[PDB]
């Protein structure tokens, strides 16, 4: 099951709200 | 990091901020 | 936190995130 | 895995559509 | 309740209405 | 059910929810 | 037009079901 | 009105918390 | 756990973006 | 098909196109 | 790919999808 | 400006990839 793939989708949406104008970098690794 | 940390355990809004800026 | 208008389901997801374990109440008509 | 955390996010979005003007209360417990 | 009931088994739109109003 | 305009991906999620096992067809241009 | 009616106009749950298989 | 303030106007994280249980 | 139910929700949103004007058919089976 | 194929393994945007048109 | 305006969290999900393993950077203010 | 181009204007999948790492 692609649990991690699905979890990441939620994570980026949450960072979008949490970070706001500050933005963020999403790196599936380092 | 982000995935390892926040997918195996619930990161609140406060814990997620560490991945901003 | 983000600084933009939150509507429809985006407001609901924001509450879900912001409120955590506390849970929340959504009443668009009150 | 945060399956329950992810499931709840979908649940609130579904209630948003299903409940409409009636609104709803989300309580991770009682 | 909601989580226990609808996360371990698929709640249709009809089953979700019970959690409205 | 909700009483508002459904567009983009929100219309797709609504169909996904409303249709259940039946599945659905989405053709924005037809 | 699905998009024409449910996005530009409002669709009852009934009208929405017209697009289920 | 939650919808009236956070959707038609902007809500700080503080104002948003007014709707948590 | 409703993993498949949750996965499908993401899938239809992705097809919405990927397919665009071409649209798509979602059938939980054949 | 779609579910079996893309839920037990990550389908990229390119792999998802096969389910369009 | 879809041919419409992508804003807020929909732009973030699009990047998540389009970028895959590559990951992405979201900076709304730059 | 990502937001300036893909949200206020339309972005091809190509333009979108300009924001991948
Ligand atoms: Cl929107
Ligand atoms: Cl999920
Ligand atoms: Zn939206
Ligand atoms: Zn999900």
From Swiss-Prot, chains A, C, D, F, I, K:
Impact upon substituting residue 24 to S: In HPRI; Los-Angeles
Protein name: Insulin B chain
The organism of origin for this protein: Homo sapiens (Human)
The organism's taxonomic lineage, starting at the top: Eukaryota, Metazoa, Chordata, Craniata, Vertebrata
Gene, per the UniProt record: INS
Coverage span on the entire protein: 25 to 54 of 110
């Amino acid at each position: 099951f692609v649990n991690q793939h699905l979890c990441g989708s939620h994570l980026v949406e949450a960072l979008y709200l949490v970070c706001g104008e500050r933005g963020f970098f999403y790196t599936p690794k380092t | 990091g982000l995935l390892e940390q926040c997918c195996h355990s619930i990161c609140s809004l406060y814990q997620l901020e560490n991945y901003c800026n």
